[PDB]
Amino acid sequence: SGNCDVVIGIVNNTVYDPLQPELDSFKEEL
Amino acid sequence: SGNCDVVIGIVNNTVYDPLQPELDSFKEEL
Ligand SMILES: *[C@@H]1O[C@H](CO)[C@@H](O[C@@H]2O[C@H](CO)[C@@H](O)[C@H](O)[C@H]2NC(C)=O)[C@H](O)[C@H]1NC(C)=O
Ligand SMILES: *[C@@H]1O[C@H](CO)[C@@H](O[C@@H]2O[C@H](CO)[C@@H](O)[C@H](O)[C@H]2NC(C)=O)[C@H](O)[C@H]1NC(C)=O
Ligand SMILES: *[C@@H]1O[C@H](CO)[C@@H](O)[C@H](O)[C@H]1NC(C)=O
Ligand SMILES: *[C@@H]1O[C@H](CO)[C@@H](O)[C@H](O)[C@H]1NC(C)=O
């Protein structure tokens, strides 16, 4: 919701997405 | 849940899939 320029006290990190790792697992392994 | 023939007042639209375009993203990745 929104962006980083409105909230007070936001910090920097990375949010893990389960779709991409799962994707690589399917095609290469075959 | 269910289908369109039981509810009263249902309208027609399209429901966006976050996975449908992302499966095409998988196609690209391949
Ligand atoms: C969180 O990270 C962003 C970068 O993703 C930081 O944004 C930078 O802010 C400085 C100061 O205004 C700019 O000089 C940089 O150009 C910005 N980066 C980019 C990529 O534009 C942000 O300051 C970070 N916030 C904290 C609290 O560390
Ligand atoms: C919502 O859309 C569906 C089609 O997806 C409509 O169903 C049609 O209904 C008429 C009237 O009974 C039929 O002649 C058509 O054959 C139906 N379409 C299909 C593809 O079978 C439905 O009427 C729409 N509802 C509203 C409220 O607009
Ligand atoms: C929290 O308080 C410190 C002072 O202890 C201040 O430097 C900092 O900017 C404050 N952060 C926020 C989000 O208010
Ligand atoms: C809502 O009311 C209108 C009359 O103003 C009627 O034509 C319509 O069929 C009604 N719809 C439902 C879902 O009851």
Curated annotation (Swiss-Prot), chains A, B:
Q: Which domain of life is it from?
A: Viruses
The residues that the database entry marks as glycosylated are: 12
What's the stated role of this polypeptide?
A: Subunit of the fusion protein that is processed upon entry into the host cell. Mediates fusion of the virion and cellular membranes by functioning as a class I viral fusion protein. Contains a viral fusion peptide that is unmasked after S2 cleavage. This cleavage can occur at the cell membrane by host TMPRSS2 or during endocytosis by host CSTL. In either case, this triggers an extensive and irreversible conformational change that leads to fusion of the viral envelope with the cellular cytoplasmic membrane, releasing viral genomic RNA into the host cell cytoplasm.
Under which name does UniProt file this protein? Spike protein S2'
Q: Which organism is it from?
A: Severe acute respiratory syndrome coronavirus 2 (2019-nCoV)
The upper taxonomy is: Viruses, Riboviria, Orthornavirae, Pisuviricota, Pisoniviricetes
Q: Which gene encodes it?
A: S
Of the intact sequence, the residues represented are 1123 to 1152 of 1273
